[PDB]
Design a protein around this nucleic acid. Structure first.
Ligand SMILES: [Mg+2]
Ligand SMILES: [Mg+2]
Ligand SMILES: [Mg+2]
Ligand SMILES: [Mg+2]
Ligand SMILES: [Mg+2]
Ligand SMILES: [Mg+2]
Ligand SMILES: [Mg+2]
Ligand SMILES: [Mg+2]
Ligand SMILES: [Mg+2]
Ligand SMILES: [Mg+2]
Ligand SMILES: [Mg+2]
Ligand SMILES: [Mg+2]
Ligand SMILES: [Mg+2]
Ligand SMILES: [Mg+2]
Ligand SMILES: [Mg+2]
Ligand SMILES: [Mg+2]
Ligand SMILES: [Mg+2]
Ligand SMILES: [Mg+2]
Ligand SMILES: [Mg+2]
Ligand SMILES: [Mg+2]
Ligand SMILES: [Mg+2]
Ligand SMILES: [Mg+2]
Ligand SMILES: [Mg+2]
Ligand SMILES: [Mg+2]
Ligand SMILES: [Mg+2]
Ligand SMILES: [Mg+2]
Ligand SMILES: [Mg+2]
Ligand SMILES: [Mg+2]
Ligand SMILES: [Mg+2]
Ligand SMILES: [Mg+2]
Ligand SMILES: [Mg+2]
Ligand SMILES: [Mg+2]
Ligand SMILES: [Mg+2]
Ligand SMILES: [Mg+2]
Ligand SMILES: [Mg+2]
Ligand SMILES: [Mg+2]
Ligand SMILES: [Mg+2]
Ligand SMILES: [Mg+2]
Ligand SMILES: [Mg+2]
Ligand SMILES: [Mg+2]
Ligand SMILES: [Mg+2]
Ligand SMILES: [Mg+2]
Ligand SMILES: [Mg+2]
Ligand SMILES: [Mg+2]
Ligand SMILES: [Mg+2]
Ligand SMILES: [Mg+2]
Ligand SMILES: [Mg+2]
Ligand SMILES: [Mg+2]
Ligand SMILES: [Mg+2]
Ligand SMILES: [Mg+2]
Ligand SMILES: [Mg+2]
Ligand SMILES: [Zn+2]
Lengths: 59, 135, 86, 122, 50, 134, 104, 105, 24
RNA sequence: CGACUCUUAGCGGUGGAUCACUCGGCUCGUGCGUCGAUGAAGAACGCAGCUAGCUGCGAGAAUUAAUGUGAAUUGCAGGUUGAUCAUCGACACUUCGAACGCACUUGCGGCCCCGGGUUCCUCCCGGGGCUACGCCUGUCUGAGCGUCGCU
RNA sequence: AGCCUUGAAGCCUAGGGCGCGGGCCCGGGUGGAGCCGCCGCAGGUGCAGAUCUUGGUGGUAGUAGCAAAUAUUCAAACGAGAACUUUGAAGGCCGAAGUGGAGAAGGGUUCCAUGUGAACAGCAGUUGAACAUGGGUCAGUCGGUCCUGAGAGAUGGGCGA
RNA sequence: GGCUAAAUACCGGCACGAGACCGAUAGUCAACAAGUACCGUAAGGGAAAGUUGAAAAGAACUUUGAAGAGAGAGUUCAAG
RNA sequence: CGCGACCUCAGAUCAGACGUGGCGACCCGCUGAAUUUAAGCAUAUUAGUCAGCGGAGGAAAAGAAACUAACCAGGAUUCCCUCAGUAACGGCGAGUGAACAGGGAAGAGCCCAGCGCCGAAUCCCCGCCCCGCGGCGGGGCGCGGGAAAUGUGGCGUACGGA
């Protein structure tokens, strides 16, 4: 995901848990040279990332 | 008195301005007292002040200071001239009596250098060419 | 060797961006801006620099408060009223 | 639909917040369509959704602050947001009443010696 | 440097996004006078400040 | 002469009000005469032009008796595109040629409620001026 | 012309040596206008010779009797047909040249 | 350097006089402004005289001018005391007062 | 491009230079 | 005749003078004469479907509402119970900065209240409100081998 | 009751002339929107120079030069095109105090892929750190952050217009 | 010890109006993305740069070329 | 020793306010040169100017005589014409340099403290009621609190006043 730059890993975890109804193993964040923060949101393995990506639209 | 704040001696100029030691400040010490008290208390407004004591190294002054925002001053028609913004920092502009004394203003033949509003207004009014339209 | 070869030794920096005026004139060891004197409460402005004043005056930026002050002045600084509805 | 503010003003707090959440989910999906690569119609719909969100939050803020200043109307101390903001110098003036106060001596002079209405002849 | 602050990195981030050419629809407008971005910085020629 | 001390008789100031006018002053500037039938009828000299008005071009190359519908009023260019006032581009497509509205007469007005309101208001002030002249 | 026109540069001359013609030149930098000739009436930019001041004498007083003489001469020659036609007026059909009409 | 025969003469332009030059292009605008303020004052006080209060007959000082007669600042308190006008009521009916004037004659 | 600043003179004539020296 | 050179003319390049323009100055005059702890001036970063700069704006982010206006905006797309413009009184207004919790790394806190965490059990997480110096009136809590009174 | 889109100004002219001259007027052309005579008024009013200022352009001149650190060759590929790109083979060099593999400061997207060959890379390029699109930097443990050092700097106090 | 309008000043600001002024080397540094690009560690220094046409009608198409470039055709009152 | 007054002095994220900085053409207060001129130069001059510092406002400042005069007297302040390049200052050199009267623009005057009389007759703040509430104001009810006799208010200020 691409995330607002003022966000914690805790806030990204709560937002991914609330918007798409999915639990999260961990969140890794980097800030791009563009300026955006990028979040790599690892999922708890009872969820498929491909299924939730097909849910939200990205394929 | 006021000694000249220059490094060691060294006024880089002509022998008139070589004086450093015996020089004197143009305002009195009571006006310095009023403006120190009124600079420390930026909200309060300086009414006036008076001599209470002196040493060889110090003089002591009481300075009368007023809230322009207290309802005993702000609701009193006798004393609510001070509540107006034209009387912000009278002590800095030479408007208290100890400041008025240093300005050299009064009526008559002794005070011709301030006829006009002040000494600066006098020097200004005298040093203008009025170039009229039709000359 | 005062010319070309001594210019190679220029890596450590003296100034960075000031955080009150944006310009790259905050001296890092004196901890003061040389353009506006930042830890001083007052703006550094001098009258021998007439051109340097006009680079940073009130006309220079957005005036994101002062232009609506001018607009509210031209109607007497009215408050609370709304115009007559349809 | 065309979310107009006038038929948002009568509605309740809960339906305004539910419509806000509906529009927020709608804007999220349009940003997904912008990043995956979608129609031109969704890309022009994103401005409609942004301005409708601004409208709904605006109406919420209207009905919030005018209820608060209905609440603090008679009170002598009200929040600084609800106090009148004109210029700072225009707030430190005397009141309309403190400007109208005279002393007793001055009122006695104005009672005794008014400026008469007179003319003089040729 | 590989060691940055957030302030300097955000400063460089802005200058990296200002560095693009003009879109080619901008010169099909009515009152165009702009042929190209004349504020293009190259990293060898002009050294950005600091 | 003009006598109002707050109207400008400067060239460059008037040109700057013209070419930097907002859109609701573009609408008033881009106005056009009614035909002698409509001017006899509504007692109105001229009206601002609209998208669905019928129109004769009076000056220029495309002038004639051919009543053409306005296609779209382009207030940015101070120009209007009329139904068959058009020419062929190089590749073969047709391009609308823009006429200025003052070189154009209206022959049918497109009458909504606001258009009728503007017409009755202009007729009213015309009759009041005629009465003060009387 | 404004008082500050041409004098808003800081510009020292380069002096002798350097094979240039001893005008004040613009101080340093990587721009076109640098070392480029700055004060003085003959430079590009720069002030002009004797800037026009607003205290030029714009207004002239004439004596009142001279002004009245000129009014009397201008009235006395407006009653002569040769002089009115030599001013250029088309007057050949006017009935009488001090042309007076009713007060209606 | 002076050539043959002329006035020995002293121009007072050795200072920076051009920073302080009063030009008078204000002048017909000040005449218009004063005239409009004068008429506004006249329209305000509606029957009252447009000049102001009466001012006294007054000799000029200095043997150059004591033949001449001016208008004074205000009427003396002895003049009001003899004429029977109270000095606070005199300001109300448009009589000038000043309490500085003596009367010797 | 960066307009080259005017030629940086660093003297050689004068008393230091031993090439072209006059009489004296 | 040749080549080369020189001169003149014609045409063509180089170059941008001249002329004609002019949404810009400059000068003079007039009216008003208005910033900020209710956070200013200035700065930083963001904001457009395609957008770098300028311009406008502030996470409601090339604007919201309201009023006037009455069918557009426009480079290309896409969509009269009021489009678009102007006005602008209602609302909102990120981070620095007088700049305000302490520092200026956006680092580290303290107090109170809410919700997940809990089943007030301490932590943990998120939200919200406070937390600058000086000074005035009053309030509470005090200090004094300061001056006294009573036991 | 001047001239002008039935062609103003400017500019060109082996064209006709006038004036002692400053200059001017006519014809031909180019040009596309203004201009001029006379009586007066006013000035920022006339250039060959100032090592004048700004812009442009010559001769020099197709000249000086593209000479520091040993060195390239053969075939094939792509391509419109190859001394220089790529692959292979050969011969060489740096020779572990490297021309190697990684970092600090600094730089700021130069990193990586794809495309282009205008400009730039002082020959050339199919190549590039160029240009245009797109991508890329993931931490409880690596650093910062924390501590204090030489030092810096508030408060109290002192001084100071 | 103290207050006090008016006449008076105003090259900053908001809003106007005018000119025997200047006319893109002039007039403000700035008629334009100008206190911009760029230079300097910094304070500071500081540009060049207006004009197709009435309307883009901005040259379809054929043709040599790898393309830049051309040759025809076409627009227009005129691409001289 | 304990309690209580008072007086001096502290601490509060105490209840409510106010100051901070900007701009700075105009204005007020300080500070304050040297180029320059004197055909040198030091006093003078430039010049109470430039730079520096502080503070305002829509104007500021000044301002209702411890004034001018010497008349047959004028009568706050400010501004204009004039006085007047004058009286005067000055290596008496270069240079500098007012005011009064007179004519106008404008015109407006007042308040304390003290001295004393009035039962503090005075002021602030908090609670409740009525009115108005986007310049928190008016009236009332409060054995509610404070300030104040180390002096609040009314009369009254040199033109006299009780
Ligand atoms: Mg001296
Ligand atoms: Mg002094
Ligand atoms: Mg004395
Ligand atoms: Mg250092
Ligand atoms: Mg300051
Ligand atoms: Mg009293
Ligand atoms: Mg480099
Ligand atoms: Mg009219
Ligand atoms: Mg110039
Ligand atoms: Mg001679
Ligand atoms: Mg008068
Ligand atoms: Mg040209
Ligand atoms: Mg953007
Ligand atoms: Mg709206
Ligand atoms: Mg609307
Ligand atoms: Mg640190
Ligand atoms: Mg020739
Ligand atoms: Mg034309
Ligand atoms: Mg001229
Ligand atoms: Mg020449
Ligand atoms: Mg060679
Ligand atoms: Mg390596
Ligand atoms: Mg290496
Ligand atoms: Mg090359
Ligand atoms: Mg690479
Ligand atoms: Mg792990
Ligand atoms: Mg210190
Ligand atoms: Mg007094
Ligand atoms: Mg005063
Ligand atoms: Mg006029
Ligand atoms: Mg130009
Ligand atoms: Mg030109
Ligand atoms: Mg220019
Ligand atoms: Mg040019
Ligand atoms: Mg051109
Ligand atoms: Mg042509
Ligand atoms: Mg508190
Ligand atoms: Mg201040
Ligand atoms: Mg000398
Ligand atoms: Mg000399
Ligand atoms: Mg002096
Ligand atoms: Mg100064
Ligand atoms: Mg103000
Ligand atoms: Mg005052
Ligand atoms: Mg008195
Ligand atoms: Mg006097
Ligand atoms: Mg004389
Ligand atoms: Mg002598
Ligand atoms: Mg002097
Ligand atoms: Mg006098
Ligand atoms: Mg008393
Ligand atoms: Zn700074």
């Amino acid at each position: 995901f691409i995330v607002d730059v003022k966000a914690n890993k805790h806030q990204i975890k709560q937002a991914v848990k609330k918007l798409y109804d999915i639990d999260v193993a961990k969140v890794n964040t980097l800030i791009r040279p563009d300026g955006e923060k990028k979040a790599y949101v690892r999922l708890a393995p009872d969820y498929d990332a491909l299924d939730v990506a097909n849910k939200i639209g990205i394929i | 008195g006021r000694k000249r704040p220059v490094p060691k001696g060294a006024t880089y100029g002509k022998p008139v301005h070589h004086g450093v030691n015996q020089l004197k400040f143009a305002r009195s010490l009571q006006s310095v007292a009023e403006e120190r008290a009124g600079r420390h208390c930026g909200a309060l407004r300086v009414l006036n002040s008076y001599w209470v004591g002196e040493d060889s190294t110090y003089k002591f002054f009481e300075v009368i200071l007023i809230d322009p925002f207290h309802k005993a001053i702000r609701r009193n028609p006798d004393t609510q001239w001070i509540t107006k913004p034209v009387h912000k920092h009278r002590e800095m502009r030479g408007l208290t009596s100890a400041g008025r004394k240093s300005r050299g203003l009064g009526k008559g033949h002794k005070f011709h250098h301030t006829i006009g509003g002040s000494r600066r207004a006098a020097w200004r009014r005298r040093n203008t060419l009025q170039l009229h339209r039709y000359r | 060797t005062k010319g070309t070869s001594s210019f190679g030794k220029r890596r450590n920096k003296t100034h960075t961006l000031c955080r009150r005026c944006g310009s790259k004139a905050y001296h890092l060891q004196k901890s003061t801006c040389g353009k506006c004197g930042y830890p001083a409460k007052r703006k550094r402005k001098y009258n021998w620099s007439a051109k340097a004043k006009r680079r940073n005056t009130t006309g220079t930026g957005r005036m994101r408060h002062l232009k609506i002050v001018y607009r509210r002045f031209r109607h007497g600084f009215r408050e609370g009223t709304t115009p007559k509805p349809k | 639909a065309k979310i107009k503010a006038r038929d948002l003003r009568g509605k309740k707090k809960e339906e305004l917040l539910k419509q806000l959440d509906d529009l927020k989910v709608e804007l999220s999906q349009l940003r997904v369509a912008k990043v995956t690569g979608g129609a031109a119609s969704k890309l022009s719909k994103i401005r409609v959704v942004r301005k409708s969100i601004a409208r709904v939050l605006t109406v919420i803020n209207q009905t919030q602050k005018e209820n608060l200043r209905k609440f603090y109307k008679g009170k002598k101390y009200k929040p600084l947001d609800l106090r009148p903001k004109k210029t700072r110098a225009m707030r430190r003036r005397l009141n309309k009443h403190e400007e109208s106060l005279k002393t007793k001596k001055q009122q006695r002079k104005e009672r005794l010696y008014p400026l008469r209405k007179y003319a003089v002849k040729a | 440097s590989s060691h940055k602050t957030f302030r300097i990195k955000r400063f460089l981030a802005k200058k990296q996004k200002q560095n693009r050419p003009i879109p080619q629809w901008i010169w099909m407008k009515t009152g165009n006078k702009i042929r190209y971005n004349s504020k293009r910085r190259h990293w060898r020629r002009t050294k950005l400040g600091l | 002469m003009k006598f109002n001390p707050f109207v400008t008789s400067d060239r460059s100031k008037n040109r700057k009000r013209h070419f930097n006018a907002p859109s609701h002053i573009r609408r008033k500037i881009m106005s056009s005469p009614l035909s002698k039938e409509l001017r006899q009828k509504y007692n109105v000299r001229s009206m601002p032009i609209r998208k669905d008005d019928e129109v004769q071009v009076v000056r220029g190359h495309y002038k004639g008796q051919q009543i053409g519908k306005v296609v779209q009023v382009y207030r940015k260019k101070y120009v209007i595109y009329i139904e068959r006032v058009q020419r062929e581009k190089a590749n073969g497509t047709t391009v609308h040629v823009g006429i200025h509205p003052s070189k154009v007469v209206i022959t049918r007005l497109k009458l909504d409620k606001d258009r009728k309101k503007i017409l009755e208001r202009k007729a009213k002030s015309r009759q009041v001026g005629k009465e003060k002249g009387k | 012309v404004s008082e500050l026109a041409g004098h808003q540069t800081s510009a020292e001359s380069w002096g002798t040596g350097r094979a240039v013609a001893r005008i004040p030149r613009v101080r340093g930098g990587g721009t076109h206008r640098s070392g480029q000739g700055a004060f003085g009436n003959m430079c590009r930019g720069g002030r002009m010779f004797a800037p026009t001041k607003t205290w030029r004498r714009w207004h002239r007083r004439v004596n009142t009797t001279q002004k009245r003489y000129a009014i009397c001469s201008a009235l006395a020659a407006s009653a002569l047909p040769a002089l009115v036609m030599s001013k250029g007026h088309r007057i050949e059909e006017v009935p009488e040249l001090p042309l007076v009409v009713e007060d209606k | 350097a002076p050539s043959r025969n002329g006035m020995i003469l002293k121009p007072h332009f050795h200072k920076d006089w051009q920073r302080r030059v009063a030009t008078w292009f204000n002048q017909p605008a000040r005449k218009i402004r004063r005239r409009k303020a004068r008429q506004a004052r006249a329209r305000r006080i509606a029957p009252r005289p447009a000049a102001g209060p009466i001012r006294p007959i007054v000799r000029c000082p200095t043997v150059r001018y004591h033949t001449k007669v001016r208008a004074g600042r205000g009427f003396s308190l002895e003049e009001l005391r003899v004429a029977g006008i109270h000095k606070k009521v005199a300001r109300t009916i448009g009589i000038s007062v000043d309490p500085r004037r003596r009367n010797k004659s | 491009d960066p307009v080259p600043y005017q030629p940086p003179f660093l003297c050689q004539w004068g008393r230091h230079q031993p090439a072209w020296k006059p009489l004296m």
